Design a protein around this ligand. Sequence first.
Ligand SMILES: CCCCCCCCCCCCCCCCCC(=O)OC[C@H](COP(=O)([O-])OCC[N+](C)(C)C)OC(=O)CCCCCCCCCCCCCCCCC
Ligand SMILES: CCCCCCCCCCCCCCCCCC(=O)OC[C@H](COP(=O)([O-])OCC[N+](C)(C)C)OC(=O)CCCCCCCCCCCCCCCCC
Ligand SMILES: CCCCCCCCCCCCCCCCCC(=O)OC[C@H](COP(=O)([O-])OCC[N+](C)(C)C)OC(=O)CCCCCCCCCCCCCCCCC
Ligand SMILES: CCCCCCCCCCCCCCCCCC(=O)OC[C@H](COP(=O)([O-])OCC[N+](C)(C)C)OC(=O)CCCCCCCCCCCCCCCCC
Lengths: 382, 382
Amino acid sequence: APAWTTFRVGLFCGIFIVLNITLVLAAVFKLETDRSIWPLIRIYRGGFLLIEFLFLLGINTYGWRQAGVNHVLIFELNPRSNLSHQHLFEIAGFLGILWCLSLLACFFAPISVIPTYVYPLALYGFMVFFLINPTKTFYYKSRFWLLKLLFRVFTAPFHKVGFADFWLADQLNSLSVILMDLEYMICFYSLELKWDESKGLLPGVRAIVQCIPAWLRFIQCLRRYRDTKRAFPHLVNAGKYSTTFFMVTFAALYSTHKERGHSDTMVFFYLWIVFYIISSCYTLIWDLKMDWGLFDKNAGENTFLREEIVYPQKAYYYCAIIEDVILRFAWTIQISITSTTLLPHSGDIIATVFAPLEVFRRFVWNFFRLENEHLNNCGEFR
Amino acid sequence: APAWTTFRVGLFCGIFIVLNITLVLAAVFKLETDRSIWPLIRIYRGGFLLIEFLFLLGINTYGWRQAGVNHVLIFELNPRSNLSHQHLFEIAGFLGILWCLSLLACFFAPISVIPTYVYPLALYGFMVFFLINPTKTFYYKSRFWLLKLLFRVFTAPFHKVGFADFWLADQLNSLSVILMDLEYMICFYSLELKWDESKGLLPGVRAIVQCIPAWLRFIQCLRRYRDTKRAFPHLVNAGKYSTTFFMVTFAALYSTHKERGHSDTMVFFYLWIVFYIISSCYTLIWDLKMDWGLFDKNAGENTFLREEIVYPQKAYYYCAIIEDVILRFAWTIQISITSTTLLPHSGDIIATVFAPLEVFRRFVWNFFRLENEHLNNCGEFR
Ligand SMILES: CCCCCCCCCCCCCCCCCC(=O)OC[C@H](COP(=O)([O-])OCC[N+](C)(C)C)OC(=O)CCCCCCCCCCCCCCCCC
Ligand SMILES: CCCCCCCCCCCCCCCCCC(=O)OC[C@H](COP(=O)([O-])OCC[N+](C)(C)C)OC(=O)CCCCCCCCCCCCCCCCC
Ligand SMILES: CCCCCCCCCCCCCCCCCC(=O)OC[C@H](COP(=O)([O-])OCC[N+](C)(C)C)OC(=O)CCCCCCCCCCCCCCCCC
Ligand SMILES: CCCCCCCCCCCCCCCCCC(=O)OC[C@H](COP(=O)([O-])OCC[N+](C)(C)C)OC(=O)CCCCCCCCCCCCCCCCC
């Protein structure tokens, strides 16, 4: 990597560190001390999740490069113009600097007479303008590749599913909090704030939006089954993704019936609980048996792992396995809380804590999914 | 060159940038109108000048390496473990971070039980301990070399004068504001300081200290004349450095008069003006003709410059000549003002704005001095 790239990575990291310390101090001492904080870190939560995801994805790229996993060939990339982990760190640091500046501007109202609620819009809009910038200036190859991939993923059944499409769609499952926060931002900027006072910091559709990434992966799996006509690897995981639909709709029904105090609430509660188990198991086993390929028959000397191990220490696997089992359930509940009103008290704390943990779980999942895809042609993308 | 070195350089740069911005913002939006901040400025000015000197010296190292000026040969350094400009940037960034943290602690008092007069002491003690660290960590080779060179410089007439000794003595001649500020800090922390309050302040020997680097250079060139038995250029250089003694003693006599009313103020003022012109012209002509080697009639198309030039543009040399004239006169006036009390108003402002300018003048001087050392073997160090 170029020396200036490493310098910019370090510069962005240092600015981000100092701005995080300043942000913590300003929040502790001089935020409002009485008004509220929740509407602020629910708009900024999605941006923070995106920055964290980019940083962890740079870590993933470094791990794949060191371990010998050919993620360039798996993602169908040219081995001469791809992004290193340095560039991912650089993008994450720059976006984190913008996020910290926007949040500090929200904290420090007397900066100007400009309303506070325009600061989030200046951030996310910039994140759009950076992404869809057609001037061929900043990471134009990678940005155009990502835009094409997003178009293919969101128009899911009408395109052949390569590894990149499935990977991005399955990672949108971990980033669904971003979509929920976008919906919340639309609702807040349509019906909540006053648009004339500094009320950015205050003194049904949601359930359907929660299942959008699961819907994309479900229709992708249906398309894969249609193309390949293999019932086992392409319909079992379709049911795995549909368990998310069932859990979300049962949680929504429970919340709606409990809002009116109906007698059917219980007859739904247990149902949701059952699916809360099934989904949590259905996604978990696929993570450990199909995504990662562990618990193989020909384990050999390695215990509970496969015959071939790419990463230097097998211990990295075992904790990861535990981590997955710990966080998969933590993911599942994090959905039901976010898409419904299951916990009118708390809930925001639970989602705000579990969403970074879900991104971390996806980050850990990437290592071994790519390791499996490299060693054995799992997913059958050739 | 190592990637982590560049990362740390960038990290310290970013931290230093954000800390400077927060520092100026605090200075604008903190402090007390009644209480002055001049002792604080005069205490931290030396550290700021040292950090600026290290940054500009890293720039000098980069310029020498790019231009082919073999500074390792003339400095008599080890060609296998010499310091790079990245490491100088690293040291400058780390020391700047510490300097900014101590200045912020003086501004934003973090602990009410810790008085705001140990932070300057803590910063300078940390600098001293970093320099004289006996363990083989944190640039131990370079620090030991610098300590040995400083010992040789401050015991000048007893060691054979190599290039490094003379160069470091000239750097001290440009940095004598650091010695003046250290003397002022010693006097302040012994005579004028209310140790019973947590605030940093309340709402003859100096002239001798002013001539320490000039005396070191004078005895160095006298030693060189004694060793080589050549009147030119060593005795001429000795006279050049003694012009500083004459200027300082006449400024001191002028300041002693005009307050005790001895009616001999005008003659001392005239003598000080004469020796101000003499010292400025002497040093400027030595820089242009002897240090840099310019104005050589054995040149070609290079008007007013030498025959052979290693820096890419000839405009650099003309800009250097203009800035050298201006900053030589500025250095002379500020070295006269700092050593005395001839300006009841301003003076501190003029010294504070001229000391970094003298550091910058020495930074520009290093380029062409080492260009002439590398090309025509000036100084005759062989
Ligand atoms: C004392 C600090 C403790 C950790 C800091 C606390 C933060 C949390 C933990 C962070 C861990 C960071 C590890 C990254 C992986 C290291 C990669 C590496 O060593 O590469 C070698 C690279 C060089 O690799 P290379 O390209 O030479 O590859 C090696 C090739 N061989 C082996 C052939 C020689 O080193 C570097 O140049 C430095 C990499 C950058 C350091 C990572 C920090 C980036 C920060 C980004 C800004 C923040 C974004 C926002 C974050 C939001 C998060 C919520
Ligand atoms: C409406 C919102 C929908 C949801 C969007 C959620 C985020 C989607 C993007 C996240 C994934 C980004 C990286 C995935 C690709 C990783 C694969 C890989 O290793 O390759 C490196 C990838 C691709 O590079 P590459 O190395 O594959 O390129 C190889 C070269 N060619 C093209 C020739 C093959 O790197 C990138 O994608 C970097 C480009 C910038 C990425 C981030 C830019 C800012 C993102 C902001 C999102 C929009 C704003 C959101 C806020 C809400 C707005 C309403
Ligand atoms: C935004 C506008 C820019 C200016 C902002 C204000 C700063 C003032 C001007 C700064 C000029 C910086 C020039 C440095 C030389 C460039 C080196 C180079 O080209 O090599 C690339 C180097 C790598 O060099 P390299 O070894 O690859 O050499 C290049 C030659 N090749 C490629 C053939 C081998 O990349 C870097 O890591 C960048 C250098 C560091 C960045 C410089 C800033 C350091 C600041 C230190 C911290 C603070 C110190 C105190 C502040 C001073 C005041 C008190
Ligand atoms: C009593 C007053 C004293 C005033 C002293 C004023 C400062 C003196 C030091 C400034 C110059 C330092 C660098 C000059 C040499 C550069 C030459 C070169 O290019 O080679 C690289 C040189 C040599 O590196 P090298 O690795 O090539 O070493 C030579 C190789 N061997 C040893 C193997 C032969 O690098 C250095 O000298 C860098 C070492 C660290 C420099 C900074 C350390 C901190 C300084 C703190 C000073 C004290 C604080 C005072 C605070 C105020 C008062 C309280």
